[model samples]
Target: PKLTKQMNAIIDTVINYKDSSGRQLSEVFIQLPSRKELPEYYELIRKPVDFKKIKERIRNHKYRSLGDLEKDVMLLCHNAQTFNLEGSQIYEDSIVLQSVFKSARQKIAK
Candidate 1:
């Protein structure tokens, strides 16, 4: 994928944040879904936010970098979980999710 200026900015932000944190989240790795993986992931999306629209934006190459792509995907995941009619049944095991939540809670407890 081509890296755009916007993508560089997004990655720089995360890198700067980690540097400021004394490399606290240094081990953190951000992974974005590929075009082929998008369809499978789309099944997890909830209503009110059209999966087709999200897919279209992704297919249009609206995002510049993988970091920017991950941000949008995370936002959609958050929204889906938030508005899910299945309540807690929507929960799934995710290494990324676990790491983020654990780090967040640790920060708050400090």
Candidate 2:
């Protein structure tokens, strides 16, 4: 539980991040496709995870481990890469957010 406590802190740091453009990962990734609905999403992304979902996961205590949290956040970034074209704003945001997560990842108490 101590490890998970550190894990939760890192995740919180990530979701609350903002880049130079002023876009929050928490804002852009809240519900993924819910911004306008999408057709390619259903086929392109077999698994879609979002910031809000993970927030609930943490809140409900269902995301009970660090690695599980890691996988989901990476997958969240991966899906963004899959659906958005390379170099697109959202796609780039995914990269930015992932880096933030990784930076926090390094801060996790061992």
Candidate 3:
């Protein structure tokens, strides 16, 4: 019960995080890339993950442990870094989120 609540808190924290330009990552990575609009995203990012998916998983009690949640959260950031160019705003935001999760993880991980 304790760990479960922590997982929810962490996701909420990162989802609410805003970048320098005041863009919320939750709004940015909320949806899976549209195959009709950005087909190349699927081609480049083989394992696509998103904030919505993560929250849904948590809601479903799919994450058996904090480690499982960490894996998906990290993938969410890495997928962004992979699909977007390094200097691009999205990529830079992913980099920042990597740090966000790391610090956030420290909040619960023993």
Q: Give candidate 2 regions above 4 Å deviation.
A: 1-4, 34-36
Q: Which ten-residue region of model 1 has the weakest summed lDDT?
A: 24-33
The digit string of per-residue lDDT tens for model 1 on 1-110 reads: 43444443443343334333355331222433443746645455433333344444556777654545555546645654554443353333123343443344344322
TM-score for each predicted model, relative to the true structure: 0.35, 0.83, 0.88
Model 2: per-residue Cα lDDT at residue 28: 74
lDDT of 3 by residue, 30-109 (tens): 77867888899988887888888898999889999888998998898899888888899788888888788778778756
Q: For model 2, where is the 10-residue window of minimal lDDT?
A: 31-40
Ranking by TM-score: 3, 2, 1
Clashing pairs in 2: none
Q: Give each model's clash number.
A: 0, 0, 0
Better candidate by TM-score, 1 or 3: 3
Quick one: ranking by lDDT, best first?
Answer: 3, 2, 1
Deviation (Å) of 55 in candidate 3: 0.5
Q: Can you write out model 2's per-residue Cα lDDT over 1-110, one digit (the tens) per residue? A: 66557767987888778766776756778776653567768777888889888877877778767778888999999999998899998898889888888888887743
Clashes by residue pair, model 3: none
lDDT of candidates 1 onward, in order = 0.43, 0.80, 0.83
Q: State how far residue 14 of model 2 sits from its true place (Å).
A: 1.1
Q: Say what the RMSD of model 2 is.
A: 2.3
